[PDB]
């Protein structure tokens with residue numbers, strides 16, 4: 189996956205007008221948008237097709253898929269039917285649940301991203317202690333795309349070590365949650381950024397500023 | 407606790423509005439509580455909740471297995487309750503802040519959170535099972551009153567019930583298609599969740615009536 193400027197916009201605004209406007213304002217800087225449940229549950233799955241029509245961006249559906257295999261398969265089918273290029277899946281529910289998603293992705297020409305460790309404080313309670321094993325499970329399953337946390341670069345580095353330099357790694361938590369774009373890109377292929385762009389006084393200037401700060405990494 | 411008719415919750419995981427409405431209508435004399443998940447919501451929109459309320463007046467549990475950071479969890483809960491869900495199901499494995507975020511929205515909005523502890527599928531044994539007792543204890547500490555645990559592992563369901571106490575409300579999927587037994591499950595759970603063995607039946611009403619007949623002494 190070739191992500192422009194190593195920057196993925198997390199579009200978590202919950203109003204169609206604002207989401208489209210803000211994405212349009214930063215469109216020259218990105219070609220990849222992460223769309224999650226805040227926007228989808230507020231405006232419908234048809235929002236994905238609308239983003240493709242307006243921006244011709246790739247769409248990662250951040251749905252943190254975390255059900256049994258039967259239900260995971262259905263969620264992935266509905267998601268890819270809506271035009272998502274990729275879907276993010278939790279690893280914590282185990283290998284069969286991940287495989288269910290991989291199967292649908294292969295059938296429909298899409299990608300699965302495996303979420304290993306998360307960026308929030310609560311991730312330390314259960315996820316963190318399982319994360320290396322979840323990453324190894326991904327490797328065993330042939331997963332090529334991973335998500336790990338900007339806010340813990342030592343954990344992000346370990347995740348990179350496990351999956352190898354050939355796998356693709358994206359990372360949320362830079363900006364609002366305190367992560368640093370440049371440090372994160374030592375290990376991740378791309379950073380995910382939401383609020384520090386879409387809540388900024390001037391979203392375009394915010395995106396341009398982030399990119400300026402990592403210019404030597406592009 | 408919510409008064410679930412016949413201790414039986416329909417898992418409506420059909421992905422077509424016409425079929426989902428037909429089947430739900432057919433079993434309405436037996437079931438007043440319906441679990442709507444992402445297979446239906448992502449296929450037909452959040453307005454499917456509105457449609458179910460309009461047509462059936464059933465309680466709606468939004469099975470969204472909420473599993474994000476606190477900020478995003480809050481947004482998901484707000485959108486879900488705005489659409490008319492009575493309750494939402496939240497994963498415990500992302501930790502206490504993520505659960506608290508959902509509880510705070512539910513409190514503000516006058517709705518309920520169900521905490522999913524252990525899951526029913528084989529993959530649950532890899533990571534979830536070993537965390538489940540602690541996830542349940544965390545729920546009790548946070549003031550969670552409603553829980554989800556697996557029909558297919560009676561021994562685990564019993565332990566979950568012990569942890570949360572007799573006053574907590576516990577619902578349980580895995581009977582029927584996944585092999586769990588309704589009667590045994592209801593030794594510990596307040597209600598069983600049943601999907602495919604009802605909604606794929608030639609006669610979903612007869613399937614529901616049959617399940618209920620088999621547990622009639624427990625009603």
Ligand SMILES: O=c1cc(O)n([C@@H]2O[C@H](COP(=O)(O)O)[C@@H](O)[C@H]2O)c(=O)[nH]1
Nearest residue numbers: 198306307360364365381382383475478
């Ligand atoms: O560990 C994770 C995994 C995520 O997908 N995310 C997602 O990444 C985005 C982060 O947005 P922000 O830059 O506003 O903090 C949100 O959409 C969030 O749900 C995260 O923050 N941490």
Ligand SMILES: O=c1cc(O)n([C@@H]2O[C@H](COP(=O)(O)O)[C@@H](O)[C@H]2O)c(=O)[nH]1
Nearest residue numbers: 256259417525526579583584600601602
């Ligand atoms: O551990 C769990 C938690 C669930 O919510 N579920 C949900 O309960 C339902 C089970 O349906 P069924 O009776 O067709 O097996 C599905 O909606 C599934 O997503 C489950 O099967 N196991």
